[PDB]
């Protein structure tokens, strides 16, 4: 299981990398834009925020297969081992096949359907990223799509991995993990909620109080 | 998983071969007729439309086993490695056995029942093609037939593959893939719908809008 | 159960009205456009083809609630008891509430989600029409949406009815009916497939054969 | 629950009417042909074999709606209260509507699909008869069709009844009854098997044996 | 079904009240605080934003039962028919019983468990509000809690209603409605997402395109 | 739903009666013994602790039906409307029938099996009390026993009620309530846990904090 | 998967051996009797009729274990590699154990229960043959018995195989195959129905029609 | 699967050993007591009735671990390879651990719960024997207990085997076998019922009858 | 399976170690604080009560990752091979990662959610301990959390083990074991209940009664 943070917040990544067992960081056009810093600036900073290790993901902007391949080359020139995110559209599929031939790892993104996702994997994508919350928000079932997609990859593209993305609540992430997703990327708020619980704090505080009351110390 | 297009539209095949990761093209008597071009003309053209690679399927027309075998020989003379489609009838089963003995790969077609499909595989067919939509249209359940057929081949004819065919909607294709079908052939309209989504286009548009608002351009 | 035909083909409606127990005819902008005849011409003809009885449905074209209400008035001036179809959008919802106040029956159309559909019923719509095949085509489950919608109306808007629409295969129609839909509208091809079966024709043939064999004739 | 015998065997009907609680007898073109006796002869004999009570069913032979209506009139002239069986085809549906208007009870027969069956009920048929075993024999599921049909009538045509027919084994009849069918017609062999059991005979024999051993006789 | 907006944004309520079929508005300490206007200012404005109709909900702040009852009286003095929200704590339960005796309608809020919720209903609360998203965020299942709570009220406190609250995505709201909740309150962002869909907008656009392609205009 | 406390702790009952919506208090030989106060002392005190209202339950000690009836008379002399608990044994069943004839309400207690419980209801018991935790502790499933018992009473003794007892955790109580139990009696620790939650306390504190920040006070 | 024909009709076996992929032929006392030819005549003819290759099954007639073993020897003297069918009775089990010691392959037949079937396998039988239709005819569930038996062999006698027999309809055969039966023997009528379908014949006809309409010829 | 007879009836064991594929015989204190013969007499006779082969089981009578180990030694002195049954009590568990160290095989008996059974296996027992019928008789579910125990051993004590015991009907034995029990011991009446069926006898008689009708004899 | 006792009661551990097949003992701050005895005294004593064998678990008290690592070192200095329990908080996760690098085995404790638990395993924890009863007490489902957690570890952290803790009843322990937990720690009362059953004691008594009635003694 590869755990990623979906952000362009360098400071947050450095801080959280010490807490979570991160595999890297994922980004998309909106996340980058929100950060205001250009790709040539943020990507290296993010890589550094992770001690120069881990995996990074960045998305192409072009609309034609040829343009997307050129975008991929540009991204790889910034981060040599970066994984290129390609929207799974007709041209996106064509680009994925071309990138597969060039040996550049890709992730099929903007996936709103299981069959669409499978096609990107069959075309060569190493990762397939369904937008869980967006599917949920638009009247579907993000979890069912993830479940169906995972089943499709398991029997039709065994080496491809589901990278679940787009979350508003920890429950969605939990369900994707229970569905078997090999990887997942979490926005900062959901990630924080996943490690902070009133019940846990109440238990721990109780342990700390009983111990201090019995041994007058805050350590073993 | 082997993805095929169910068509005799050479121009469309060339165009779509660049987008989809195609394993080849399947044809049947009605599709060929609709194209208006004879077999010795269209098959080579289709083969060329795929870059001289991929697998092709063509159907026999004879009603007797002997006649079907002769049809198979004629088809193989047009395309040396073509897979011969044989309707799964009493004479068809006899033809399939004969063709196995001759080493000519076959596909049991016109399958409307799971047991019927299994028999063609036991007779030697490498592929079994249930007519999903026709079963649905006639008051049955194309998906249940495919599910039952796949289970039968899995435990009784492991090397045989289900090649799901006859589709009116992407949902039928999705369900066949979720059922575990090793191969599938899609008509052009369903294939196009499978890669075109209003939600996906909206997401890409949003990404472009955010990118421009932060960088004054829509290019990477 | 209310059975409708989704068409603007007057001749076909007249012919099929003698076969199917029709409740009326439904139309939408595309169906009207494909017919080429204007509303003030086609609607009256459809009513006539229906023997002067039955229910008709026509859709508004305006984008604002005020405009939609005006469209509704125009439609009602053509067919006094026509049911006005309103796309379930923000403005559509506003229009539905206004039309409810005016006593003009409405149908919430262009429904791609169950909650969206329920909202139109809560706003006053007598019918809610999910686009089954479109939901299926776009990676969702038209049947699950219909099932969820029917459940929502059953417990939250008991007097509202689901009018299932958008079909490519009889199976989709069957599943909607099994889900409990109170009404359904079928395109001509699906309707025809629903009453034509090779197995049925064969049974009729065998009966005649046995009859002729015992009585030397195929008639009573 | 209306229990019928599917036969034209007058002697058998007379004998079995004393054993089973029969509602009447059903016939079809093949069953009549097998008996060799013409309609004007067997129908009255069957009515008599039923003690002059019960209900009878006979099938039309014509292919056009007009012809079927004429056949219905002829059948009613033989047996005044007979229920007319009409194959559920396009013309059959038209005939059913006409017969409803004329007040002649009908049964939609030769039903191989649930939707097809529902249509006959919506057209006016009092009974809908799916051919259970034929559906089973042709690769489908007669029981699922019956289950689906019963569900459709229950929610969309409450006063219509399913009259399950076509049986090769008691299990099929049991499953139709468990599905809720309001009526059923059994061929003579299945009916006999339904009341003859080795286990039952063994129990009865054991009771006689114990009684004999205690009271020196097998009589009460 | 009672549809509420969870907000203190008067302008938004006025605007959305013409779109959604609202039953009223719900508020809580954090929502009021975020709006900055005092209770005796915002409550009357919200009532106004809804044409002087609809139901309002406001929460007590006191920690003792006696104090909560006094808070309830104060709230009722601002809005005569307001429903008083009481956190379901030991003292909250006591307050609910006292308010039931005084005839002041209450809602048991801050519900994180089904049994806790049931207790508030047994104490007299007309509504029980589980915090769906918070339960989800804290490692539980908001939907299961809602499902369990609804069942408990259905069989043990039939007149009490579940008022589902705390949402981050439309899917949570849909699931609560499918669970049978009699009422629900939505934050503004989720409510807006529930009526805005790329697929719906695309369908409307297509309708307009076909209409103009046939009639030369997009109106009428 | 009747909510009871399973205790002989008068002070606790007085305190909790203002918090929980209690129907009364249940006792058994061990609970009374634990309290040390004799029956004719504690029962009146418990009745007073509840403000002179509510229902009380006390158990017989005799081993013969005649002795149990005498015990019942003695209990009724202490509390006129008390419900007499009778262990469901052979003699207990006999006593229950006798007490029904005498018009003294009974509860069949010490129930470890569903059939055993049903028998007590058929004999006349108004309540049947399965020992949920003891069944769980001894390798069975207290919840399944309660579920089975409730189903048995529902269809075979409609007026009898299940009074679920013996709890170590709130989850057991929740499951009994979800199973449909008409009544339940909780030991003090489980009852307290059912109304105290770290998550709830965390939420309430947050509301106070936000309120303070906006209005400079913690009061409404 | 071993497919057998349950018959003594030599001519039919010869004809069908060319169509179906047969593993051999099974016979029983009634089947042999129906053919009127003695064992020493039919068995040899069947061996050559099936293709000189394949497996044959014949049943013992003796009632004692010793007699059954002698019958087995006689059968083996007619067909050296024949599999001996032994009714699973007390003496039958004893015979199966003896034949196991002698190295003569056996099949436990006349199986009406799963446990009974398992016992024959534990005793040494290579095949276990439940009488599916007879179980169905006598008020049980042939399919459930087969399902249970297959499970028992799978976990308790892995090398034993279920040889499903006794069929009246293709559906029973399909269900046995779906249950995982390693072998099955079909009566001639069911076998023929399994390869003859009105829908399949119709598909072949339409293909021919479209073909000749476009190419002015019937041939490929 | 090890099949045992639960009895001390030497003559019966000798007779049935020729019919069933027995693994041996199990005994318990009550079974032995009923036989009236002491252990030093019956055990050797049972071993002899088994042809001097197979496995035997006998139970300790001591109540302390030390006493049980001494009892084990006494039993082993009678039958060198006997498996010692130890009731799964606290002292029994201690005894099982000691017997494991002493290399004497044990069976944890008197198991009324799954966790209890698991503990005996973890302590060293080779077999675990739940009392199926007693569990059923006492208001529980013997089959569920067996199912749970088998699951526990399968995942937590792989080398331990369930030896299901205590039966009143064949169905219980069948269900234990379907649950996966590796061994089972049957009382003589249940064993006999498992191999004697009216339906089977009828089938055999019919075969003999048909044979006679065709060959004038009932022998081969 | 690893069976542990959750206690600091040295005398009890010594006594129970002779009965249960223990893997060791687990402790937490509350267990230790209650004992008032320091860890450098209690741990060695528990280790000794275990015969100088088995695994021990002790919890850190520090609130920062650095402090927790120091606590771990101190614990390891008391018991060289002790497993260090770390509360799964943000700092706890950081500590687990650090301890993983130092080669000190850890257990992620105070787990109230499945995702939280998985994170501790992904960080390096060998064991993950959900507080089953506390989750149950706080309105959740301890068993569902354990089930979800086990599934997450099985597919995402295969070498990590669930160590179920916090029990009030044997049923909770049984369900955790049925869920597949690799380890479990029981408080003394639940452990004792798991090996003491009235039904078992009664069975032993009956055996003794029968034995004496037949042999004049209850021994041998």
Swiss-Prot record, chains A, B, C, D, E, F, G, H, I:
- Known regulation of activity: Inhibited by glycerol, inorganic phosphate and arabinose 5-phosphate.
- Name the Gene3D superfamilies for this protein: Aldolase class I
Q: Quote the cellular component terms of the Gene Ontology held in the record.
A: cytoplasm
> Which domain of life does the protein's organism represent?
Bacteria
Q: How does activity depend on temperature?
A: Displays a broad temperature optimum and is active in the range from 20 to 75 degrees Celsius. Although no significant loss of activity is detected after 600 hours of incubation at 45 degrees Celsius (at pH 8.0), the respective half-lives of the enzyme are 200 hours at 55 degrees Celsius, 30 hours at 65 degrees Celsius, and 16 hours at 75 degrees Celsius.
| Pfam families for this protein | TAL_FSA
Its biotechnological use is: Is an interesting tool in chemoenzymatic synthesis for the construction of chiral complex polyhydroxylated sugar-type structures. The use of hydroxyacetone (acetol) as a donor compound allows access to various 1-deoxysugars. Can also be used for the synthesis of a broad range of iminocyclitols, that are potent glycosidase and glycosyltransferase inhibitors, from dihydroxyacetone, hydroxyacetone or 1-hydroxy-butan-2-one as donor substrate, and a range of acceptor substrates.
- The record's disulfide annotation reads none
Q: Which residues form the signal peptide?
A: none
Q: Which GO terms describe its molecular function?
A: fructose 6-phosphate aldolase activity; identical protein binding
InterPro entries per UniProt: Aldolase_TIM, F6P_aldolase, TAL/FSA, Transaldolase_3B/F6P_aldolase, Transaldolase_AS, TSA/FSA_arc/bac
User: What does the record give as the active site?
Assistant: 85 (schiff-base intermediate with substrate)
Coiled-coil region: none
Which keywords appear in this protein's UniProt record, sorted alphabetically? Carbohydrate metabolism, Cytoplasm, Lyase, Schiff base
Its chief place of residence is: cytoplasm
Per UniProt, subunit arrangement is: Homodecamer. Five subunits are arranged as a pentamer, and two ring-like pentamers pack like a donut to form the decamer.
Q: Which family does it belong to?
A: Belongs to the transaldolase family. Type 3A subfamily.
Name of this protein: Fructose-6-phosphate aldolase 1
């Amino acid at each position: 299981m590869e755990l990623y943070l979906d952000t362009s917040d360098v400071v947050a990544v450095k801080a959280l990398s010490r807490i979570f067992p991160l595999a890297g960081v994922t980004t998309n056009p909106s996340i980058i834009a929100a950060g205001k810093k250009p790709l040539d600036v943020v990507l290296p900073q993010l890589h550094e925020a992770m001690g120069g290790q881990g995996r990074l993901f960045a998305q192409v902007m072009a609309t034609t297969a040829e343009g997307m391949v050129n975008d991929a080359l540009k991204l790889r020139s910034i981060i040599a081992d970066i994984v290129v995110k390609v929207p799974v559209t007709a041209e996106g599929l064509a680009a994925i096949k071309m990138l597969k031939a060039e040996g550049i790892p890709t992730l099929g993104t903007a996936v709103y359907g299981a069959a669409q996702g499978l096609l990107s994997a069959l075309a060569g994508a190493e990762y397939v990223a369904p937008y869980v919350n967006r599917i949920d928000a638009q009247g579907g079932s993000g979890i069912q799509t993830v479940t169906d997609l995972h089943q499709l990859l398991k029997m039709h593209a065994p080496q491809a991995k589901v990278l679940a993305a787009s979350f508003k609540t920890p429950r969605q992430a939990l369900d994707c993990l229970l569905a078997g997703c090999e990887s997942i990327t979490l926005p900062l708020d959901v990630a924080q909620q996943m490690i902070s619980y009133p019940a846990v704090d109440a238990a721990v505080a109780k342990f700390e109080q009983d111990w201090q009351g019995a041994f007058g110390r805050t350590s073993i």
